[PDB]
Amino acid sequence: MISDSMTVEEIRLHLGLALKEKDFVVDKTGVKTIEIIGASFVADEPFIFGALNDEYIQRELEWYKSKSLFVKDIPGETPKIWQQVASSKGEINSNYGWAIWSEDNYAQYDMCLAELGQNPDSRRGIMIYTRPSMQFDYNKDGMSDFMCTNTVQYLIRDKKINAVVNMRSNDVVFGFRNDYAWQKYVLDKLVSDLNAGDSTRQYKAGSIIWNVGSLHVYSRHFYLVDHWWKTGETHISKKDY
Amino acid sequence: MISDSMTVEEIRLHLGLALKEKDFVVDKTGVKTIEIIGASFVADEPFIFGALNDEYIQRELEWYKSKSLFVKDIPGETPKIWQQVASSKGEINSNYGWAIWSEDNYAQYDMCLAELGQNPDSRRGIMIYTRPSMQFDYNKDGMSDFMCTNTVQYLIRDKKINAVVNMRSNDVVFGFRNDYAWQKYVLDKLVSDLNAGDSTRQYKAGSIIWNVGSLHVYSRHFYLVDHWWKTGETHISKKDY
Amino acid sequence: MISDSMTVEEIRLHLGLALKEKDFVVDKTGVKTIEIIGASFVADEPFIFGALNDEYIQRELEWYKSKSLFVKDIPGETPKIWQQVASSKGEINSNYGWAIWSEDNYAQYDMCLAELGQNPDSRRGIMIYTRPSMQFDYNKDGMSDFMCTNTVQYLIRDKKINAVVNMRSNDVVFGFRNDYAWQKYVLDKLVSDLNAGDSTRQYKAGSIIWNVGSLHVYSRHFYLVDHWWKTGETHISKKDY
Amino acid sequence: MISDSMTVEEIRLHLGLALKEKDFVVDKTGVKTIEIIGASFVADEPFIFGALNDEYIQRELEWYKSKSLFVKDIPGETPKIWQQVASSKGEINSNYGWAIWSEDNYAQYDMCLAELGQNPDSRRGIMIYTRPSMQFDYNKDGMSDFMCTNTVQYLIRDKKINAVVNMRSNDVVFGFRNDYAWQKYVLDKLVSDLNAGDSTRQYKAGSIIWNVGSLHVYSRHFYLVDHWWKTGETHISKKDY
Ligand SMILES: Nc1ccn([C@H]2C[C@H](O)[C@@H](COP(=O)(O)O)O2)c(=O)n1
Ligand SMILES: Nc1ccn([C@H]2C[C@H](O)[C@@H](COP(=O)(O)O)O2)c(=O)n1
Ligand SMILES: Nc1ccn([C@H]2C[C@H](O)[C@@H](COP(=O)(O)O)O2)c(=O)n1
Numbered sequence A, B, C, D: 001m002i003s004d005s006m007t008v009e010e011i012r013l014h015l016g017l018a019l020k021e022k023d024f025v026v027d028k029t030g031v032k033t034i035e036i037i038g039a040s041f042v043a044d045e046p047f048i049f050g051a052l053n054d055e056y057i058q059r060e061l062e063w064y065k066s067k068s069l070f071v072k073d074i075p076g077e078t079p080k081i082w083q084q085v086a087s088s089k090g091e092i093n094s095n096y097g098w099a100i101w102s103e104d105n106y107a108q109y110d111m112c113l114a115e116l117g118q119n120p121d122s123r124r125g126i127m128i129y130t131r132p133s134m135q136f137d138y139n140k141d142g143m144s145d146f147m148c149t150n151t152v153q154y155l156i157r158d159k160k161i162n163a164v165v166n167m168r169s170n171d172v173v174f175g176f177r178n179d180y181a182w183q184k185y186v187l188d189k190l191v192s193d194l195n196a197g198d199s200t201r202q203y204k205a206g207s208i209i210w211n212v213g214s215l216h217v218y219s220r221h222f223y224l225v226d227h228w229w230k231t232g233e234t235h236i237s238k239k240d241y
């Protein structure tokens, strides 16, 4: 059986509680955050707070498909968030397409697909994003990019493929929205590829279970949590706030 | 805030429910298991079902301290569970001492200690056990040992150090008991080492949060679950059952 | 008496002659081969052309020992030659360990051992790899794997155990090297097991006689034959050629 | 190219040498044999020693065409050689018509014909006589009949169809004469059927290459080898000897 987990609605409540109680933690950039430690919830909505920017997510998807470790290869103007984290040569670590499709990271997608194709009940169907050398690689050439996704495990039960996403660190506003879109994309892809392999499989996408070491909101987004706390609206304009 | 998690008592309940409903999944060895997918709970007891064997855990600890990848180096007679999983030369992957203390796995303990010593609020204090090449290494020389612990993250909040344990796969009876004893040992060690570095830190061991992709009981241990279901006792003799 | 057979040196000569005369046969993949039909020789060297890869043969041995019909179970990264031949679920037919050690294939090794242990002069000591249903099984679930080893017979004469290997099809470069290493392993095993049964037997490994319906070199390896023809060297680098 | 093989004349010479040198091997019935191990020769004559009994061969052909596994179904009086090998119910294994024409043995003739009709260059055109379960079937109900023909492979090269006959065991005097007549019959049949399928094929019967694990003469026939050794005559009456 799948575990009885929190939903995104309950996560919102706990974040609102944390803000109400001034449970602040200082970020490495010196700014305040509110935070849930050891968060586990079913990602039953594609965002927690904020607006869905489908245009941005598609540009990040294209970049992941390219497997490029260089931020300039993001289609169009590279977001400053990626710029400020990049090395002196414009290089990063956290291209998730590189993580699951590159032979340099040992063919995570293909091997997980082969494992589940051979044994649908397997507990070894997993895509390993991070690596032990990340202890030294995170600041190569002056980048600041310690892989925040650790592993994603895929478990086929009752003809549904469930994804257990294990993250070290996840920004509630920008991070979760983008990362969810990515994990949903890969899950749908894996379902497709397994079904294409054998027409009698008839697998369906199941639940995405989100496990985060530190799930946090930065102080620049406190107004979103606050507004939701007062009104139940998951988004405002900064100007309307 | 730390997430409001299940406890071990609630895990026991959900496992008993799975057995009551005959919710069986077939193991790779062909035997039945009951299973909770995406389990997340606070490890507030040192076992789930079965008895505590302090003698065995100490032998496994000594082996981890040696960092040897060879099962014969386990003090005394090597358990057959380690024998059957080993390669043709007696080698394995899953020596956790090797994982966190070897320079070959990039000094996970020392680097996590250095990170937390420098920034106590860090989200980057993590010990990475598994590796991307595990897709190929798991059956090197005919072993059958795909690392079941992925990562363990350590978060210092309110002067308590919390461990977020991310496991791919965990046997409820033997695995959890042994692995918990190990994770508790490492957490106490890390608290000690940080306190030894600065007397004003006064850190204390916090909660160990257990995240498991597949948390399962093998059919050979169903009698333990069944007995607890009927009586509330967490252990019987196989003969008494 | 053992028949007065060709040796590997003479096979090399006849292959070089076939290439010199442009005696080409078109493979099922559309590529050219040179070929000796009804080849019979004593395998008095462990290869014909090309280098010996002890690392690879040991991985294939480990896989045979596992008896797994799934190519992912080959230790490490599965060679693409095994990948392209496998079914939609990664399954094959030609695990020779399965052929001689599985109860599913009627215990070929054990029965041949029992036969020779009881009557050392027997003509019925044989390990039957292929099966009549191979006419239908060769492309089960879209695999392309028609068993190339038919039978191996073992004859004890003058306290030496001779193996008569009957193959339908054998690639001179990769196939013969790997298959010889396997047949030599099994012969040494059988000698050991018979000697262990009775200390007065004092059997020794005899000759391995290789009988092949089609013994062929693929066009991608013609440079090896051509080079040996010119120089007498049984191996070059593709780059050096 | 077809391998440069021994002829029947050279086989005669080697058998005569074996007798001259008293290279005897004890049969399972307690009688002496002389023997060539791993014999490979082109069957360029229809007998080795002895007389051609066309009358007997035609009765065995009729029996094979019937596909009956019962020896009483041999036309006329059943030869005592077939009687002494039969089960308590008169049953045997080695009806070669059953082996290649029965659906019970997976339609060996038809499938080999379909393979060569689709791809004339195929290395997979083979009729598999024996089976893995022969390890247990050879003495079913007290018969003594371990299939002595393993496989026959057909290779079409230069519009000639060559047959590579792989036998475990073959009696030089009665066995080879009968078995050769059978294999020649099937080869001619296969040529006919392929030619009837397409008038532009114009295939012709090629060589029959005979591969035998143990090619032997029983002591009751030593007088034939001896007489040939002295006179070069391939047959005498027992009375004239
Ligand atoms: N795909 C990504 C990449 C990064 N982050 C966010 C999480 C943290 O806010 C920050 C990483 O900081 P740290 O490494 O200090 O956790 O980036 C995220 O949520 N998702
Ligand atoms: N320290 C360890 C090592 C192993 N396992 C158990 C979990 C599974 O029962 C099995 C691994 O099997 P799989 O790789 O098929 O999950 O070993 C565990 O619980 N803890
Ligand atoms: N153990 C093996 C398995 C396969 N083959 C080679 C022989 C042929 O090159 C090919 C099989 O093709 P076919 O079935 O068309 O003969 O694989 C081999 O030599 N030895």
Ligand SMILES: Nc1ccn([C@H]2C[C@H](O)[C@@H](COP(=O)(O)O)O2)c(=O)n1
Pocket (backbone or CB within 6 Å): C123, C124, D028, D094, D145, D146, D148, D169, D170, D171, D174, D175, D176, D179
């Ligand atoms: N069609 C057949 C059937 C049988 N045999 C002969 C070969 C051996 O002399 C004997 C079988 O004995 P074994 O099984 O001990 O080899 O029968 C043969 O030559 N041809």
